[PDB]
């Protein structure tokens, strides 16, 4: 439904979800390595209502 | 479908047995070590080529190659491995049956030819997921790559 | 374009094979070990100079030097390596094919002459990027330097 920027992260809204991208790179919704989670990974926070 | 048997060199009289698919494929006994010419037979590549010759004669299609430090048992697009064990003869550190599922980053085979994948699982020491690592032959590294399917 | 083959000394009868560019360059068999004068042939520098003599005779231009603990295979500004493997004969710890791409800081060659670069990649243990490290010959260190191009 929307494009929004938030702390270097491109972001989309969704059915109920908020999906922010990677910190340095806008067009990337996946972490660099699922070994060693590295604090810049994309986040999937469902709006809990 | 694929598989690797590492070889690391003998040590003066043990049995080297490679079970593929249930049968007792590829037996060899390192000699007694009494005569001085038997020190040639603990060479890793000589042992690899003898194990691969036994492997080719005792399996039907099963294309295997003598690598730098392995033999690369492949199944010919039909049947699978379905059972893969290796009676070392010495302790665990003589010949290693290694597959696509090593359980740490330290236990990981030395050459493992160019297109090869390992699902690193666990080690139960850090709260970590299970990540996949591919080898490269031009640059001898182990970088992380995708899943299979 | 460059390359290094470390040598670490023999161990009484194995094959030492250095593949450059696909061909089977530079074969040598360490002797049986029966006669007492064959202990000279597990010297690392004697083995290095014999492997380099084989290397110079079995390649065309290919300037190689016998270092402290290596031989330094160079390509003469035209063609490249394109394939670089080394059948150890013993386990991984006899002669090491090492390139510009070692995968940790621990695995890193001992001398590696003065102008040399290594892209340290991964090790998949810490969330770390990939950094480059240069050797110095006056002060035997490994400090970090730039990228190549």
Swiss-Prot record, chain A:
<comment type="subunit">
    <text>Interacts with head-to-tail connector protein gp8, the tail component gp11, and the fiber protein gp17.</text>
</comment>
<protein>
    <recommendedName>
        <fullName>Tail tubular protein gp12</fullName>
    </recommendedName>
</protein>
<comment type="function">
    <text>Structural component of the short non-contractile tail. The tail complex is involved in viral genome delivery. Forms the end of the tail, including the canonical tube, the nozzle, and the small extensions below the fibers. Once the tail tubular structure is formed, the interface between gp11 and gp12 generates the proper environment to interact with the six gp17 trimers.</text>
</comment>
Swiss-Prot record, chains B, C:
<protein>
    <recommendedName>
        <fullName>Tail tubular protein gp12</fullName>
    </recommendedName>
</protein>
<comment type="function">
    <text>Structural component of the short non-contractile tail. The tail complex is involved in viral genome delivery. Forms the end of the tail, including the canonical tube, the nozzle, and the small extensions below the fibers. Once the tail tubular structure is formed, the interface between gp11 and gp12 generates the proper environment to interact with the six gp17 trimers.</text>
</comment>
<comment type="subunit">
    <text>Interacts with head-to-tail connector protein gp8, the tail component gp11, and the fiber protein gp17.</text>
</comment>
């Amino acid at each position: 439904n929307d494009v929004f920027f938030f702390r270097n992260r491109l972001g989309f809204l969704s059915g109920e979800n908020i999906i922010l991208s990677r910190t340095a790179k806008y067009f990337n919704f996946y972490p660099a390595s699922i070994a060693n989670l590295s604090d810049d990974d994309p986040i999937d926070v469902a709006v809990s209502t | 479908q694929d598989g690797l048997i590492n070889v690391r060199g003998g040590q003066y009289g043990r049995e080297l047995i490679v079970h593929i698919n249930g049968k007792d494929v590829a037996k060899y006994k390192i000699p007694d070590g009494s005569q001085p010419e038997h020190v040639n037979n603990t060479d890793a590549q000589w042992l690899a080529e003898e194990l691969a010759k036994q492997m080719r004669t005792n399996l039907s299609d099963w294309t295997v190659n003598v690598g730098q430090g392995f033999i690369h048992v492949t199944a010919p697009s039909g049947q699978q491995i379905d059972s893969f064990t290796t009676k070392d003869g010495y302790a665990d550190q003589l010949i290693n049956p290694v597959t696509h599922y090593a359980q740490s980053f330290s236990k990981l085979p030395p050459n493992a030819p160019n297109g090869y994948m390992v699902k690193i699982v666990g080690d139960a020491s850090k709260s970590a997921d299970q990540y996949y690592v591919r080898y490269d032959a031009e640059r001898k590294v182990w970088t992380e790559t995708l899943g299979w399917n």
